[PDB]
Write a protein that binds this ligand. Sequence first.
Ligand code: HEM
Ligand code: D0L
Ligand code: SYN
Length: 455
Amino acid sequence: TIKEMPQPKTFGELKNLPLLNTDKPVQALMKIADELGEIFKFEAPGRVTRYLSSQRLIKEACDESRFDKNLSQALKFVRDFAGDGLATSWTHEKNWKKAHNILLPSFSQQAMKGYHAMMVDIAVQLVQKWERLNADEHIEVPEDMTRLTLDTIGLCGFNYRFNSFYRDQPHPFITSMVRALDEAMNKLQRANPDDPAYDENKRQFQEDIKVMNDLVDKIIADRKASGEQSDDLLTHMLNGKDPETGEPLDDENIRYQIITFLIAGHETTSGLLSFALYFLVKNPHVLQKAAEEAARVLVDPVPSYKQVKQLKYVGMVLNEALRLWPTAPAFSLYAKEDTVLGGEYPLEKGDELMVLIPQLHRDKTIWGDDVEEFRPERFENPSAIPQHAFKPHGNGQRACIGQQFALHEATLVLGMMLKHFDFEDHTNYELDIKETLTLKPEGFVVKAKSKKIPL
Ligand code: HEM
Ligand SMILES: CCCCCCCN1CCC[C@H]1C(=O)N[C@@H](Cc1ccccc1)C(=O)O
Ligand SMILES: C=Cc1ccccc1
């Protein structure tokens, strides 16, 4: 009955920690899952977790009566600058449910209608950039997709223009963001984060937290002294009141939310768009089908909210890209009470789980033997997909609050991309996945041939 779960190779007192001493640790954990199966123990000094890779077990871990969201070490280090914003707070901290209640209406399908015009603004800047490239120039795909999604969250969220398409070199806030995210992730591997080798990293980390707080606090202060009532997240946050506590967010927590949304904008949707275009150029028949939908639906020079809603195949393209390469590749859980997982693995209250999403999405008992194939038609009927087989936005009440935002922006942009250009994988690009907070293709380049359709 009770099975003892495998564990990858250890390093004396360092346990399994040195296995994360790599620049692609998620992909390294995936290969361990290939070797060891649906569940394996992973220990570091002072920490134990268990990596889940099968739908059989993950469907139990997604039972919210038995498991709640845990902060991974990664999220604990990001909390150093994202605070108790939505993504780095515990479910039982008062500011989680309060910010959740206040911000839910800002992220609904209905709220998407109000953001649509300003996502079209940024999306048009992307298309015009590509229309203006010279023959036999190429597109740096993740770079441009990150320019897009950062600008979109800046504009839709806070009425601020990062003007990323006017730049080679990030806005100063983004420089500190990206550097702080890099330190947070690199910190995870250090066997001794106290060696003086890491003193400068420590110094630079604190400078970046200060640059980030000071610029956000200024934006908050400036908006409050202004009165301007633009329909953006910062206004809803300054004006909204939690129905439960009846309280609004305070300025410190609003700062944390803004940092949180900007991290999410920069990191996740740009990865998704990059992986989707990669899969489309590697699967020309799928690109054809999606381009045909784009041409048939996007019949005006600017897309409308209604038309984006009818880009249904583009949506399953995005879902299939999230299946093979979920850009936020894991989440962590803890047992609310003693419980037995899958009838085989007893857990005590407090025990942690890691959900390894890319491996879940390769569970052959779920998707069949063509699991590595890019086939958006898998998603034709969600009722034919078993429970909790597909988890790119997390689980339950702690699922991605920005899920509709991301899919509206990604659908609109990919739709316009397919309306306006033919794409050529001119380098026969070999997929290379760089890991930061999230997963992104690195070095992915294509050529676009304009269809010469006016905007
Ligand atoms: C396709 C792109 C995206 C993916 C794959 C994604 C995925 C996820 C996942 C897996 C989680 C749960 C993490 C955990 O349980 O520890 C999450 C949480 C979250 N995401 Fe997203 N996300 C995306 C886009 C966005 C965007 C655009 C925003 C907002 C601008 C956003 C805001 C959040 C927030 C605030 C949370 C924490 C929510 C809460 O716990 O209340 N995400 N996301
Ligand atoms: C927000 C985007 C997703 C971030 C998810 C984490 C993304 N990690 C980045 C590296 C792999 C992955 C992960 O498995 N992390 C674990 C690592 C860990 C486990 C046990 C002991 C020490 C450290 C953790 O952070 O605890
Ligand atoms: C820290 C921000 C964040 C945003 C989305 C998912 C996980 C983390």
